[PDB]
């Protein structure tokens, strides 16, 4: 009985809720994306997330959503990798930010 998606690894923190979900790509809400090194990430796109800290500075390298830049995002409690914050590189994009949360990093399984 919950609407929330929590850190699989510590399960102490809610990251987002089902109602944040949207399809940025007409690939639906959650598609498989491949990183440059062969890691596939079923990344769910949500408008808002919380309890996440950022690593590094934003990059556009190999961005899965062109126009947006990624910044690594991890659990504030366990530091487990959760996904990325995506921030638009152009003023005319919408939204200006969302998050892409990796499926294998959340409970329940989506």
């Amino acid at each position: 009985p919950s609407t929330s998606l929590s850190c699989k690894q510590c399960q102490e923190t809610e990251i987002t809720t089902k109602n944040e979900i949207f399809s940025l790509s007409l690939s639906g809400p959650m598609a498989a994306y491949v990183n440059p090194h062969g890691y596939v990430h079923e990344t769910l796109t949500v408008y808002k997330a919380s309890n996440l800290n950022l690593i590094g500075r934003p990059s556009t390298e190999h961005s899965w959503f062109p126009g947006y830049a990624w910044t690594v995002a991890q659990c504030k409690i366990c530091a487990s990798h959760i996904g990325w914050k995506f921030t638009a590189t152009k003023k005319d994009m919408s939204p200006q930010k969302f998050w892409g949360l990796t499926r294998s990093a959340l409970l329940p399984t989506i």
């Binding site: 990183n35 890691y39 690593i55 487990s80 990798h81 990796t102």
Partner: peptide, 26 residues
Amino acid sequence: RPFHCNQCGASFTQKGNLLRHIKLHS
């Protein structure tokens, strides 16, 4: 930051941050 994580793209200045991070992917 010359240390990069192949899994997610995190970059680090210190080797030791990388090690910490990579362990968590386990």
